[PDB]
Amino acid sequence: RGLTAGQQRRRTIGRSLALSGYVEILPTPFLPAGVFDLWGLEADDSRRMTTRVLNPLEADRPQLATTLLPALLEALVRNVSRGLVDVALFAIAQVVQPTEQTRGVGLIPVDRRPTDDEIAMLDASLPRQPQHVAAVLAGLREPRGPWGPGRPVEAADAFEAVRIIARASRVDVTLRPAQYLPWHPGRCAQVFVGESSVGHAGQLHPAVIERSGLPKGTCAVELNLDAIPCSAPLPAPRVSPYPAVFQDVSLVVAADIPAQAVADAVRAGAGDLLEDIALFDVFTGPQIGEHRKSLTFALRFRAPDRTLTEDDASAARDAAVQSAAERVGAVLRG
Amino acid sequence: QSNAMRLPYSWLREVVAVGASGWDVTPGELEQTLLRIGHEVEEVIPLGPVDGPVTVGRVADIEELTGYKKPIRACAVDIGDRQYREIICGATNFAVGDLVVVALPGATLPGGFTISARKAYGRNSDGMICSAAELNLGADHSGILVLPPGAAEPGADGAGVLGLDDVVFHLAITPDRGYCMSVRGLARELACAYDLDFVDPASNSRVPPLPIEGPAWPLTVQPETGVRRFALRPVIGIDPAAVSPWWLQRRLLLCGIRATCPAVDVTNYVMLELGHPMHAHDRNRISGTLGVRFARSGETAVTLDGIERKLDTADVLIVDDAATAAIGGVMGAASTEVRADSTDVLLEAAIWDPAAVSRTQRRLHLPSEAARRYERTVDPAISVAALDRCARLLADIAGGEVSPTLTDWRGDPPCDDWSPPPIRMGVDVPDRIAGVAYPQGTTARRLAQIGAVVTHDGDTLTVTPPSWRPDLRQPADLVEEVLRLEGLEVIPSVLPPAPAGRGLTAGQQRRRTIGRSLALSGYVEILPTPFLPAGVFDLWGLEADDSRRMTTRVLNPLEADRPQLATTLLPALLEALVRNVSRGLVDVALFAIAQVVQPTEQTRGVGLIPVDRRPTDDEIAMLDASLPRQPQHVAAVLAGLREPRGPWGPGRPVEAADAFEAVRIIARASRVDVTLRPAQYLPWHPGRCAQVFVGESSVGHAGQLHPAVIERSGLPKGTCAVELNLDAIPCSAPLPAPRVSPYPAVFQDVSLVVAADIPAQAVADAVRAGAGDLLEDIALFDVFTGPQIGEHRKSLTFALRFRAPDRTLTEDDASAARDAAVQSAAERVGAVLRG
Amino acid sequence: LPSTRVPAGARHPIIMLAEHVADTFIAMGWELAEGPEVETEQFNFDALNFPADHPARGEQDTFYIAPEDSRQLLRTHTSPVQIRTLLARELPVYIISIGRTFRTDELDATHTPIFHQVEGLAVDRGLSMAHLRGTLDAFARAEFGPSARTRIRPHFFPFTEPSAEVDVWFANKIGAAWVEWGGCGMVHPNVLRATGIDPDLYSGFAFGMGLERTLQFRNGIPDMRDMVEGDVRFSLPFGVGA
Amino acid sequence: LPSTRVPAGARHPIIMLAEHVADTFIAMGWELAEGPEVETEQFNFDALN
RNA sequence: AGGUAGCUCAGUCGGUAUGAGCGUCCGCCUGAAAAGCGGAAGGUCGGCGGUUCGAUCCCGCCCCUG
Ligand SMILES: N[C@@H](Cc1ccccc1)C(=O)O
Ligand SMILES: [K+]
Ligand SMILES: [K+]
Ligand SMILES: [Mg+2]
Ligand SMILES: [Mg+2]
Ligand SMILES: [Mg+2]
Ligand SMILES: [Mg+2]
Ligand SMILES: [Mg+2]
Numbered sequence A: 001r002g003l004t005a006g007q008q009r010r011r012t013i014g015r016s017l018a019l020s021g022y023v024e025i026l027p028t029p030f031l032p033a034g035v036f037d038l039w040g041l042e043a044d045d046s047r048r049m050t051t052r053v054l055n056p057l058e059a060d061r062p063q064l065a066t067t068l069l070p071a072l073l074e075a076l077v078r079n080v081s082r083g084l085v086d087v088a089l090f091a092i093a094q095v096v097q098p099t100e101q102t103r104g105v106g107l108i109p110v111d112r113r114p115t116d117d118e119i120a121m122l123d124a125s126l127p128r129q130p131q132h133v134a135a136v137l138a139g140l141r142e143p144r145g146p147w148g149p150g151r152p153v154e155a156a157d158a159f160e161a162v163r164i165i166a167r168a169s170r171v172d173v174t175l176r177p178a179q180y181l182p183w184h185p186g187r188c189a190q191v192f193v194g195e196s197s198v199g200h201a202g203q204l205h206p207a208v209i210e211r212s213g214l215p216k217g218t219c220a221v222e223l224n225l226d227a228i229p230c231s232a233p234l235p236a237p238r239v240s241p242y243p244a245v246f247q248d249v250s251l252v253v254a255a256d257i258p259a260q261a262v263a264d265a266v267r268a269g270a271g272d273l274l275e276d277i278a279l280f281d282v283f284t285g286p287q288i289g290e291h292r293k294s295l296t297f298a299l300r301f302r303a304p305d306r307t308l309t310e311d312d313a314s315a316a317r318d319a320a321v322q323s324a325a326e327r328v329g330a331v332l333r334g
Numbered sequence B: 001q002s003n004a005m006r007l008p009y010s011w012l013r014e015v016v017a018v019g020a021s022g023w024d025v026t027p028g029e030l031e032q033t034l035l036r037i038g039h040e041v042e043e044v045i046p047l048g049p050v051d052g053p054v055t056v057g058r059v060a061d062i063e064e065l066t067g068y069k070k071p072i073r074a075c076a077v078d079i080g081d082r083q084y085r086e087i088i089c090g091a092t093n094f095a096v097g098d099l100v101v102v103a104l105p106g107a108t109l110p111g112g113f114t115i116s117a118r119k120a121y122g123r124n125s126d127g128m129i130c131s132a133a134e135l136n137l138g139a140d141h142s143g144i145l146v147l148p149p150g151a152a153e154p155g156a157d158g159a160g161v162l163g164l165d166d167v168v169f170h171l172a173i174t175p176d177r178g179y180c181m182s183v184r185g186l187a188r189e190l191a192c193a194y195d196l197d198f199v200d201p202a203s204n205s206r207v208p209p210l211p212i213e214g215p216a217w218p219l220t221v222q223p224e225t226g227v228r229r230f231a232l233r234p235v236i237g238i239d240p241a242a243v244s245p246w247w248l249q250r251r252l253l254l255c256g257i258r259a260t261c262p263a264v265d266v267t268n269y270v271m272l273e274l275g276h277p278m279h280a281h282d283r284n285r286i287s288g289t290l291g292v293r294f295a296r297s298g299e300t301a302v303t304l305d306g307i308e309r310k311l312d313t314a315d316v317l318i319v320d321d322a323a324t325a326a327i328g329g330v331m332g333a334a335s336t337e338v339r340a341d342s343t344d345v346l347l348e349a350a351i352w353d354p355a356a357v358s359r360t361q362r363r364l365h366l367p368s369e370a371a372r373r374y375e376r377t378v379d380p381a382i383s384v385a386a387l388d389r390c391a392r393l394l395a396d397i398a399g400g401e402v403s404p405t406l407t408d409w410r411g412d413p414p415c416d417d418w419s420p421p422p423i424r425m426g427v428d429v430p431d432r433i434a435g436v437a438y439p440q441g442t443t444a445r446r447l448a449q450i451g452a453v454v455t456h457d458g459d460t461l462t463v464t465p466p467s468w469r470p471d472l473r474q475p476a477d478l479v480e481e482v483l484r485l486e487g488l489e490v491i492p493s494v495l496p497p498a499p500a501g502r503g504l505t506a507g508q509q510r511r512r513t514i515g516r517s518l519a520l521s522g523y524v525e526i527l528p529t530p531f532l533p534a535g536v537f538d539l540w541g542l543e544a545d546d547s548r549r550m551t552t553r554v555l556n557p558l559e560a561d562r563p564q565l566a567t568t569l570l571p572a573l574l575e576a577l578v579r580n581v582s583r584g585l586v587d588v589a590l591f592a593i594a595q596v597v598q599p600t601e602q603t604r605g606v607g608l609i610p611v612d613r614r615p616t617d618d619e620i621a622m623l624d625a626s627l628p629r630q631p632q633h634v635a636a637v638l639a640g641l642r643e644p645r646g647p648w649g650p651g652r653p654v655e656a657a658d659a660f661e662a663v664r665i666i667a668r669a670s671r672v673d674v675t676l677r678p679a680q681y682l683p684w685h686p687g688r689c690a691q692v693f694v695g696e697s698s699v700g701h702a703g704q705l706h707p708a709v710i711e712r713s714g715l716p717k718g719t720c721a722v723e724l725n726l727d728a729i730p731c732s733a734p735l736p737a738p739r740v741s742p743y744p745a746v747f748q749d750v751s752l753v754v755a756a757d758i759p760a761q762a763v764a765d766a767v768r769a770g771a772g773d774l775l776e777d778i779a780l781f782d783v784f785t786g787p788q789i790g791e792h793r794k795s796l797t798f799a800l801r802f803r804a805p806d807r808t809l810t811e812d813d814a815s816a817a818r819d820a821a822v823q824s825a826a827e828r829v830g831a832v833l834r835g
Numbered sequence C: 001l002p003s004t005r006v007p008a009g010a011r012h013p014i015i016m017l018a019e020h021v022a023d024t025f026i027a028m029g030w031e032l033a034e035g036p037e038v039e040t041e042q043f044n045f046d047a048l049n050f051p052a053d054h055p056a057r058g059e060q061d062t063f064y065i066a067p068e069d070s071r072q073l074l075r076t077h078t079s080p081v082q083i084r085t086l087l088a089r090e091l092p093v094y095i096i097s098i099g100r101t102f103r104t105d106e107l108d109a110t111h112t113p114i115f116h117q118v119e120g121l122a123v124d125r126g127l128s129m130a131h132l133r134g135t136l137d138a139f140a141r142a143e144f145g146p147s148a149r150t151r152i153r154p155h156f157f158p159f160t161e162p163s164a165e166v167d168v169w170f171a172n173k174i175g176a177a178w179v180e181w182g183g184c185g186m187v188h189p190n191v192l193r194a195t196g197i198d199p200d201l202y203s204g205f206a207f208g209m210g211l212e213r214t215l216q217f218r219n220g221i222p223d224m225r226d227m228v229e230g231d232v233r234f235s236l237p238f239g240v241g242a
Numbered sequence D: 001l002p003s004t005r006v007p008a009g010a011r012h013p014i015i016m017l018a019e020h021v022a023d024t025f026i027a028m029g030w031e032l033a034e035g036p037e038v039e040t041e042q043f044n045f046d047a048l049n
Numbered sequence E: 001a002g003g004u005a006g007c008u009c010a011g012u013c014g015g016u017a018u019g020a021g022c023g024u025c026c027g028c029c030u031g032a033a034a035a036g037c038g039g040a041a042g043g044u045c046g047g048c049g050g051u052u053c054g055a056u057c058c059c060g061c062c063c064c065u066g
């Protein structure tokens, strides 16, 4: 029957990250010594609950990884110390997360097939070993050349790696603000598919970067592939050939209102006539006022059965502005 | 529709019921049985229905209402028992004493049309006299329905006299079952499906042979024309006033034929019943001996429709001493056409060569009821049986005398057995092909049902198919008959084990990789049409001798102005680009992977190679070399913003370097190295155009399109394009073994001045050649012109990364390698160290 | 904030359907064969046992190539790859071929003059109709899910005897009914003869399905025009395809 | 002039070798099965005799 | 019956295209937009021919849609 959907998806994720500039590493499962203390994790952080090897090759590295980031950060430091300072790495590998239900099982007779409960009990006694995908970035994301001076790695680059993986998995994601070491508390997104959390992304905490000897501005992504449900969509797009109407709308909200929430409100009020919405400006200044920001979206309206009139588009736009007011307190720009 | 067969259920059941009394089946069950044995049922059309007072009437008087524009008449009609009604009608295809179908008020016609009393014009209209279309009986609405005289008496129920409880089946017959283009064939097929005894309506038990006491008309037949049988039988003293009865006109109508005179009605009726086309010649109009010969070089002839047609030396026709009588098996001439003037007719029963009729009817563009059946072979054994059936039915209707004389040409060496050669086949061969162990005797029984003589001899059957099945020639043909009658649903599902395959070829795998790589970089794949836009190469301003103008052309394109097959993928990509832009999607990146069509001087036709053997190796090489070159190309086009605007900034418009990068995306996906060299090549911009090389082989071009081309073609300004020949890119399977030194690197930059038209790649190659192995990386990051440089010059600054494989490289060793790089650039491109 | 500075593209849905079909058969040990779009009449018709001067051939919806006597055409089906493969390969043969085909049908919601077919061919010792059914069922189950069923009913093609048409049934359709899928049959002994193969030692089956038709009823695409006009709005919802 | 603003990355050579091996056996009708890295002695040793 | 500016349309009865709306460009407005005002650019009058000193206008043929 060929490859399973999960095997096919693992290939697609790696192809997609490699094409976008990421270099795959094979991550070692032996954590660096004291990594979670360098990260400043709490004592009860689930990542500290590690499976341990009795006879490791390095006596100070007996713990199996609960997360792929320390192996990726070790390979990043190796590249940087050899003079390759502009680096994007990724890994697709399982981790080891023991629970209280992780324990040893006595020898089962081998002169017959084990029973179904014996099989289940052997599987349940093993630590959880889910597939993760993770990536780290440092230095220039885009190199300098005859076109210009390039572009340094920023947290948006980690968020985009999330979307690269989401498109490759053919799922939709939302990114919500979050505070979760070792990420920077102001530059950190928790990643959701539906209402299920699947991982985190953003810039690493400056104090973690200092204690760990990492490049300044290092960014990172880690997602649990086993939490992303497999999908086989059957699209049937509507492709209207009637002309579109193009209008921009400029909206003022409080400075901590997420732009995605404003776009969702705009979309909800505009209705089916709205074919596309795109944010292209975020402005602050004395005209706007303290603690406020202005967002401007390009809107594209189109009807399925007719040449949409301007006034029909403007009525959909007005309903969009009204939904933004009700939902996020948006105010039309003057 | 040249494969259509329309017949009413009642007529079909009648023929089946002769050998199986009381056989009746729902239309839905019959539909499933016909599908199970291999006949497509396109539509099942139940007649009517009518509810309420629908009665046959008799028009008494026609007080024409003068003054109006259209002819409007008021009619007095008897609905039986002499209780008269007044109706207003507009039709004028009936006179006094005609039988009609009236729809009194309260009746409901198909569908949802209730008839009520209305005041139309100056009189009261109680009901209405109906047409065949309004009754859901026929397809004619130009005139109302006129039943023939004596079809019924006034007062009879309309649903009964018209047979509105009948159902009409419309079937699409496969071209191998021409015997099913008749009631005879389909009735036989049903008898096989239902295991019924079958009485052939063409057997002498059902059509008693008429006497043959002499020849009926002089006849000479050129045997090279392909005619297999030609028969003639006259009928003398027909009544020109008599019409065909209702049961015959109705059956003709339900099958899609409109009645005329009884002489032509019976020929169309026997053709429908038995499958043998039939033509009526006016015996009084035939002057001399009839001759079947080929047509001369310019001999023309008018058909019974009045149109003259230029014949060909391959057309077979019948001709007397006067002029041509008919185009054999296609259409008869107006010379010997039977009319209301005619009294004595001469019926012809002919079997024409199928290939000859097919050629002529297509070259002349008139498929007829006769030509469709001759194209698919007609049973040559029933010619006289259909001739006697036709003559006996004509006199029974036109009150004539069947002349007891008959001509029957059966070939220059006359033929008395029309059966195909016998076939030998193992008895279990159907079982092996089906994967099903059929019960004992199944093959022999099924093959007898279809009409074949079967003889046993141990494990071998000798099957002689009947004369109406010239398609049964090999054991495989007999297997189809057994399996389709037993039903294909009994065949089990057994997944065969295939050998260990080798997977995808390197070229198949590379086409996937290229597609994944361009899509991930933002390109959208289109399926490119091979029909070039009209005038494209003139819009491009190509020279007259440009190889892209040498195109293969299609004789029957869908758009008359687009017959040329594409030699380049770009016009189809640019057409899809214009379509997106005109729909408001102005920032577009498209690509396509598809073959082009490039004919050469060796592109030519190859005559038929015999198919009873494998073609020789030279014949294979002839065929292959005769086709136009069809290499695989990959191409892409871009317009608008390459990168969109967002909170990061204003975006970046498409530039030529985006086309150069698509080249490099393709090269990496192909795992080859490319070089881009300056070039001039329409439709590209001559200052922004690269030719792409792999080694020293050209594989295509890239860059920005020419501004003159863009304006002439209505393209967006700045449109860029790429086209590479994938077949010219050699497949590579490299096995890298990288040297990865862990020793520290030394980073130095060098600024070099060169002439302004020296390619930056040439400078970097010179720097690399002189630096040697210690150089690990070289990257250009600055291109500068300015007054501190001088005119006609430019300055290039490269970042260099040096590294040793066994030691911590010193700055002096690195500087020595850098000095050698600068010296190499001096000697090769004239570089001068920046001061 | 939006973060995609380089918007994703998209491989074409028909190309991706073709890739899924290819992978389905390669996973069963089959291989992928190829053939050109402009073809000889020798391979499009004559070696496939089409009669000359006969409605089975003349009423095909064929694009003929100039000059009048060229006997060249745009192939009307992928079945000439049967001939090319049997001439080029040693027996046994288990192959599919996916490529463009051309008929003189006007573009509307349910027809396109340019379409794709998948051709299947298996020639070996002892192959039967039951082996044809098994392959069709595996093909259906892989493209339509575990509930997929096939059914065959007799029909006609010059290059097969017996011939049949294939309907397919899958859940969450329409919610479920038989849809016409393609044609199949046992390879005609005249086809084997024309390729130098002994019909007394080898038998074979073949099949052919249109991909645009498959995509139309599997996905519920109303307008076949959207599959061929190159509008980016049609392709992008299907994803990158990597 | 150089044109690669987004330099290409790379899947790992061992992963690509693995993919070639996998594709080799799928093309032969075989399938690809999976197992955890932290395993029981029961399956690593005892049931393997 | 019609084809007239990049599109959608008035209008010109042999020698001045008399034009609108949209779109585009340019100002004002906005930090920048959309929208809104203000102004400008924009016309072998369907193609090939005839007639005429001269054809968008008359004559012939033909392409395009209802
Ligand atoms: N060539 C047939 C399909 C087919 C292929 C192979 C065998 C039988 C039928 C078609 O175009 O419809
Ligand atoms: K393509
Ligand atoms: K044809
Ligand atoms: Mg940001
Ligand atoms: Mg607007
Ligand atoms: Mg506007
Ligand atoms: Mg047959
Ligand atoms: Mg230095």
Ligand SMILES: [Mg+2]
Pocket: B751, B752, B782, B783, B784, B795, B796, B797
């Ligand atoms: Mg410089």
Ligand SMILES: [Mg+2]
Pocket: E030, E031
């Ligand atoms: Mg301002």
Ligand SMILES: [Mg+2]
Pocket: E040
């Ligand atoms: Mg002006």
